[model samples]
Structure formats: C-alpha cells, structure tokens
Target chain A: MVSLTERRKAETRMEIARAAARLFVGQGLRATRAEDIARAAGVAPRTFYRYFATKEEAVAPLYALGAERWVRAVREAPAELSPPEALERAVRHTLTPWEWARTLIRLAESSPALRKVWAEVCHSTERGLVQALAARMSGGDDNVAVRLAASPRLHFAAAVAGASVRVAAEHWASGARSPLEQALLNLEVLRGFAWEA
Target chain B: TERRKAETRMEIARAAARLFVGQGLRATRAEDIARAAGVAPRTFYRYFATKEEAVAPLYALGAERWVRAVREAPAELSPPEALERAVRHTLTWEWARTLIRLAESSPALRKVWAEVCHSTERGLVQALAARMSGGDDNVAVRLAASPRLHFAAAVAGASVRVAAEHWASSSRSPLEQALLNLEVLRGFAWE
Candidate 1:
C-alpha cells in the first residue's frame, strides 16, 4: 500500500543518494557543502537538512536499499533455519552489490563526525532485526535466546552480528574467502557470544 | 627509589599530555608519545592504550570512589533514582568531581574524557549484562533462568552514555536533564 506522494519521495531519496555518491567521489566528502548538495539534488537547503541532518547522511541511502533487503531476507527465511544461517544467506544475496558498501566505509574513515551516522547503520539494522526476532518469539519460536522483550542481548547479538558482517568485509585478504563468506564465518564466531552460556 | 619511581611516573604521565598538546591528539601517535615520555613502546603498554586512555588513571580515580557511592545509594533509593543522583552529583555539585576536573584541566579535555566516559559505559554494559544474565553469560542458561537481563544491560549502557552526553551538553547541570532523559526513556519500559 504505497501512496503516490511516498513513491515520489522514494524517487527523490534515490536521486539524493546518487548525487551524494557522485559528490563524494568528485570533490571529496569533506570538501563538499550541504548547499552544493541541495542544489545538485534540486531541494532547498532546509529541505535537504530535513531529509538528512548531516551532509554525510546523504550517503546512508546508498546502503539503505540493501539493508532493507537484508532484513526482509532475514525475516522471510524459513522458520526452521538458525538465525545466523538465515542472516548469512540474507547478507550474501542483498550484498550482491558490494562496491557500494566499501565505498561508504572508505568515505566514513575520513571523518569522526561522519562516522557517527556510519556507525548508526548497524543500530538501525539491529532495530529492524529485533522486531522480527521478537515477533518470532511471540509466535512460539521460544528458541530466540532471551525472548524479544526479555533480553537486550537480542539487540547486542544483532549489533555484534551486524558489525561482524562488516568486520569480515574489512579483513577480506588476498584470494582467501569472499567478504560474504567471511561475514558468515565471523557470525559463526559471534554466535558463541550471543547464544552460548 | 620509591620517590624516584613517583617522579618518573609524573614525567611519564605529563609527557603523554605534553605530546598530545604539541602535536595535537590525532598527530600524537603512540610512538611519538612513548618517545616523548622517554619510555619504551612496550613500557607505554604498561600504562595506557591510547592517548585518550593515557589520562584514564586520573579520571578513573573518581570512578573508584563513585563505585562506593553506588553501593550506598542502592541501599536506600531505587536503582533508577540512585543512578540519577550519582550522575547528577558529577554536575550538580562542584561539577569538577575530581575526574571532571582532570578533563577540565585539559585544553581538549572533553575528547579524552569522552573516551573515559565511553569506557565507563562499556564497563556498565558488561556489569548490567552479567547481572541480566544472572552471573552467567551462557545464552541459553541466562535466557532460561532470567529473561531480559541482556536488554537490561543494553538499556543501562544506553542510559549512562546519554546521561553523560546530556550532562556535558546541558551547561554543566546534568542532574535534572539526565533524570529527565531517563524519565522519558522509562515511559517505554524498565526492570
């Protein structure tokens, strides 16, 4: 049930993401100003600020589509699968587009303030996964370790698991494992922290 | 020479801050800091991890005292109230609070203390998480034994980090603001 206005807004968000990626690639993320982005995106500066609190936030949507796909994939995975297995598959498929993730990470490395929103990607992703995990527990899938309402461990697990995905990517060395393989491999390690006694 | 030991420690600590001030926090690498302090890089490991952590012992001194205060406050007030007052005391009072003073002593004190405060937040998470899991972190056991301990720990971490940032931002009177922030959060839920 998507509205007309919402569809238009989504299109605008896509344009902004495209514009931001180009600007970042061109003049450098730090060198570009919000006003310049606003003009490039054809929005008022206030409108631009309304859409994104920080100029760097414009880059978030670059991953937003993939993150959404990642979550829905995790949620839609068969009920019998282990959460980590489900998430690993979701990550692999959604991350079919890989260069974009690496791009944002490189840009964020340049500024601390920029890293704030960068880090929040995991938080927001965790928030989504938490809701889905909670719903599973509510529906009698009691195995989710700490029912959705009971443990912040769910979020911790999500945060840790989510971050591990990227850590695996960052460490992708020579002809070794692919980033997705590394992500899933690391999640196997993280599961010990999340579910083990 | 115990006195010699004390003097050398002072020189080591000051050298870190001195190097940070001269070259700037980012420019002051661990190598530069160690060289300036006249200590081996290995010896540097004997003290702190980063330039920010170099100042931790000073700030952590007050944190040790606050631990005792928490023991007492929980004896009377609810954990929530006790947590609020303890945080407020850092700002509601001299606002310097020893460690607070240590950070204030720095020209770029907030950044270092930011690490100190952030460190405290991580420590609180472990404490809360452990408590949530009932002294055992076994995911299955803790979940089966007591639900929501993980959430409790996560919440506490969130609370401390915010109370600290809010206190720092609200013109030094963090007590009311922190309590207010907690109150707003409590509108959702708590254990």
Candidate 2:
C-alpha cells in the first residue's frame, strides 16, 4: 500500500507528465519549453525543475512505472504458477489500460527528441527487467533449469509487451475502436506454451 | 527553407565519410574533412560538433529510408516479404558505401554500431507498429510484428558484419548475396 505522502507525490508526478506529454504532442518537443510544461501543470517553473531535472525526465515516468509494476507483479505472483505463466501475468497486468503509458507513446511518436529519450528508457528497462527476473530465478545448483526456463520467457515477454504497447498506441492514434482490447486479444495468443521437461 | 542547409550537411558528411575510408577515421582530422568538402575548418565544425557526429548522418539516413520504405510497402505482401522489401530498399540506398567505409576505418564506430543500430531499430519498430495497428486496438498484432522488426534489424546488422569481413577479404560479391545468406542462415533448420 502506498503512503498518503507517496500517493500525493505520485499524483503530482502524473500531473507533470500529462502536461508535458500534451505539450510535447501538440508542439514538437524541441519547440515546447520547460516553462510551458510548468504552466500546464499549474506549477511554478522552479517547482517543475524540482520535479524533473530536464523535460526528458518528465516523460519517463510511464516507462518507469511499467517496469516497476512488472517487477512487483512477478515477485508477488502465486508460487504455483509456472515461470512463463507468471511472466505473462505480470506483463498483462503492467501493460493493460494505462492512459499515461498511451500518452507517452503518442508523445514519442510526435517528437524525435522524445523518441530518442524513450529509446534509451526502453533499453534501460530491458536491462532492469532481465536483472529482476534473474534475481527471482537464482537459487542452488538445481535452479539451472528454472533459470533457463525463466530467462527466455522474460526476454520474450519484455519484447512482446513493448511491441504490444507500441501497436496499441498506434491503433489508438488512428482512431481505432477499443484499441486496448484488441491489443489484449493479440497478447492472449501467446499465453500458452508446451513446456518440455 | 532548409533544403540548401540539408544538402550542404549531406555533402559534408559524404566527403568526411570518403576521407575516413581513404585515410581512416582516426588519422583523418577536421582539416582533412574540410579540405575534402572544400570548406574551412570552422565551417566543418559549424555543421558537426565532432567527427563522430558527421558520420552519424549515415545511420540517420538508414533509419529514415528503412521506415519510409517499410511504410510504403505493398499491403498485399506478407509480413516477411514486406520487411524484406524494406531491408533491400535500405541496403541499396545511398549510404551503403559510406557505411562500409566507416566500418572499415573506425574500430570505435564498429563497437558503437550496435548502439546506432538499436536507435534505428526503435524507429523501425514504431513504423511497423503503426502499420500493424491499422486503426485498431490490436496489441497481439503489435507483438506478432516485433519478431519481424527484430528480424529486419538482425538482418541489417548481419549484413554489415559480413560486408565488413568481405571488405577485409577483398571479395567483390554483391551485398544482396550476403544479406540473403544471412537470412537463410537465420531461418535454416540446422537440426
């Protein structure tokens, strides 16, 4: 459970991100000033600086949120779930119905500057997810099979999840009906796998 | 409005790339590049912040052309076919020689080339996603599209790796052959 103070901070962070995203999508990231984001978020310029060192940082919370939620979901999954099932569950939970994630995607599509930073964030997230999965799989010598099974699932899940988000966002941008639902259906196709012991 | 500036930047980049190939990126300096492009040393710096930045245009061009080609591919074509068309379009584009040269001359660029390719990969993935989305909320389609996106990137990277080796060996075979061979190797059932 999040503390009230932490929740308040998260809300402020989300507000800054939504404002920055709207500004970035409307005007190119290069054309949108930090002051514009501050104004949009109803904060002073100094307060904006306090929240984010650069405009790039303001747009990164969604990516960070996805990674954090994925790690938490994986860590808290039922012990009875298989490794791949656990990973799939974690991915679905992290990726579904997040307005902020969609906004970040649109902002990246609109601005090359944002795209560049977004790419970096993605690489960092991939590394983090891989490390987190590795930690969960690590154990005694008998855990090699567990590690091997988990590694590929984690990699594939991360790749698929990233791809799904991009696709879903593009569909949303194109005025598709229930884009998130369509994306979820697509992901369901990969939910089951035949494991060989 | 910025056409002339864009053209000049391209000309400077092409010249710098040629010189780097001829002499080497390490051995080549700003003076050498400016002389090759028929500009002053200050003018060279005006266009690019550093030597690496000048060479980066080749990678940028690769990304742009690849995405454009993929976006405009025939809708009737299968996913792999469309991707192959995009790959061929990018491979046959204007920067091939310069990319080959840079790979030959600069060890630093060679090591950093994966990072460069990753940047391009992101753009290509975005382009693929847009096409696959087709104005629907289809996350599954997007996920399915990723394998091909990664496949294209892998093909491009493999081509460069093989081309670099071929250059070192003084082989004269066509680039398409190397690319095709790479695709085959990747798709082959070795078992």
Candidate 3:
C-alpha cells in the first residue's frame, strides 16, 4: 500500500489537474492563466506552484501516474502469473481512470500546442515502461532478446489500448448508446487474435 | 474568412514551389520567389516568414487531404482499409509529384522537407486520433493511430526514394511503378 503522505500528494496533484482541466476546456490553453487555475482549485496561486511548475505540467498528470501504476502492478503481480497476463491486467487497470477524463483529453487533442506536450509525455511514459519491464525480465542485462521481447509487447499493448479508446470515443462522439461498454466490447474482439499460430 | 486567406496562401505556395523545383531550394532566393509570385521581396517575407514557411502550405495540403480521406472512410471498414485510403489520397495528388521531385533533386530541400513531413505525421496522427475517438484524449487511441500514421509516411517516403533511384538508373519516369511498389510492400498480394 502507498504511504498516507504519498496518497495525499497524489490526491492533491489530481485536484490541481482537475482545476486546470476545467480552465483549459473552458478557455483555450493559451488563454487560461495559472492564477485562474489556482482560483478554480480553491488554492493560493503560490500553492499552485508547489504542485506544478507550469500550467502545461498539470494537463497530463495521468501520463506519469499511469506509468507508475503499471510498473508497480507488474512488479507486484502474482509470481505465478505469466508476463503477458500481468501486462494485460496492468494495462486494463491503468486505463480505467482515463475513461472518465475523456472530455479534457478531447480539449487537448484540438490544441496543437498542448498536443506536442502530450506526445512528449507519451514518449517518456513508453520509455519508462519499457525500461521497467526490461529490468523485471532481464534483471538489467539489456540483452537483445530481452529488449526485443519487451519492446514489441509494450508497443503492441499501447497500440491496442490506443485503438480501443479511439473506437470507443468515436462511438461516444457519434451519439451512440453506452460508449464505454461499446469500447470495452471492441477491445474484447482482439481475443480472437489471442492464440499463437 | 480564414478559408480565403488559406487559398491565397496556397497560390503563393504553388508559385514558390515551382521556382524551388526549377532552380533548387537553396539556389532560389526569396527575391526570386517574390518575382515569381509577382510580389515585392518584402511582401514575400510578409506572406511567409522564411523559405521553410512557404513550403509548409503544400505539406499542410497533403495532411489536410489525408485526414479528410480517412475521416470520411466507411465506419465499418477495417483499420488498414481506412489507413490505406488516407495514404493513397495523400500520395496520388499531382502536387505530390512535384514536391517529391523537388525533394529528390535538392538535398537542402529534402532536409527541410523531412522536417515538414515529421510535423505532418504528428498533425495527421492527431487528426486520425480525433476522428477515431471523437476528439477524446485516449492514449491508446493516440498510440495506435501513431504507428499507422508513421507506417503510411514510411511507405510514401520509400516510394519517393525508390523513384529517385529508378529515375537515376533508366533516365525515364517510373512514378507509377514507384507507387505500386509501395502498395506491394504493404502486403497487398494481388497487386
């Protein structure tokens, strides 16, 4: 279990992010000021700086948090569980919170400036996750087979999850019934490709 | 309002592109571009802050067409089908031929052109993500869309590379075969 202080910090970070999201979606990212974010979060402007250095930093808290959660989930998974099984579970768990934050994400998508930051966060997250997995599997050898095995599976998982989310969000945007359920069902279709040839 | 400005920008870009293709990007100065576009040098600078900016319009056009094609794809189509349509729409344009030719002939233009292509990939990925997810911030969707977008760009870049190689060899045009080779590389068995 995470320490109480760490949990509080996480909560505070999420709170700050939630405030920034409201400001970001309401006004454009360029127009939303940091002071506005502090006001929205009911915190002092100085206190806002305590959590995030720049306004953009607050925009993608989940990116780092998601990677951390995934790494811990994989590390703490039952020893008997296969790597792939642990990965699938970790990914599923990591993505659950993002489902509810879809609106803020949409806002980020429309802004090119914000999208650049988002991409950097994603690249960093991918690198971090790959390294974490490699450490677990190879115990820090950085061997070709270990690297190759870790890289593709990580890429494949990221791709599948990305596609499933896109399909789900599209359904939601198109005014479909139960968009999240539809997305989950769409993800499930990949089970057909599960078995090795 | 913005649309009209965008069109005028395209006209200026076409003139600049033609000059760059005829007398290499580095060889062709902004003054030459101003003359070609029937504008003063200062006006050329006003329209595009730099030579790179002038070329950006064409790059943007390719991106716009690609995204438009993919976004309009049939909802029931497979992901690969959607991606293929977008790639073909982007590559088959007449302007693409000139741009590709210009990039092949001029090393300096090729470098700047690669940067333009990188930006286009990022933009197209976002466009694909938004269309695929209804403008949501879905990481998995963004990631999935990125590789598909990158793969499409790789295919187009390789085609131009091969076309340049073949043109050097036979001293004859082989654009059609270059494009066909890309489709084949993508695992299109029947072609």
The DockQ figures for the candidates are: 0.04, 0.09, 0.07
Poorly placed runs, candidate 1 (over 4 Å): A35-50, A63-65, A140-146, A152-156, A172-177, A190-197, B1-191
- Expressed as tens digits, the lDDT of each residue in A126-177 for candidate 2 is 5465554555555434466356434434444444444444445554653344
- Tens digits of per-residue lDDT for model 3 on B21-135? 6776777787787787777888778778767568877766655665577667776654456666655554453345567666555544554554454455455455455555644
Docking class of 2: incorrect
The DockQ-derived docking category for candidate 1 is: incorrect
Runs with alpha carbons beyond 4 Å of true place in candidate 3: A1-15, A22-33, A40-42, A49-57, A67-87, A97-100, A111-113, A122-141, A145-160, A166-197, B1-191
The true-structure Cα RMSD of candidate 2 reads 9.3
Candidate order by decreasing lDDT: 2, 3, 1
Candidate 1 residue pairs in clash (backbone atoms < 3 Å): A150-B148, A151-B148, A151-B151, A152-B150, A152-B151, A196-B139, A197-B137, A197-B138, B132-B149
Best candidate (score: lDDT): 2
Winning candidate number (TM-score): 2
DockQ of 1: 0.04
Query: What lDDT tens digits, residue by residue, belong to model 3 across residues A1-197?
Result: 99999998778778888788777667767788888888888889888899888887776675456556765775566655555555556556655643344555565466654555544454445445455445555644668536544443433333343344443553244234455554454444334222111
Give the Cα error of residue B29 in candidate 3, in Å.
Answer: 14
The Cα error of candidate 3 at residue A34, in Å, is 2.9
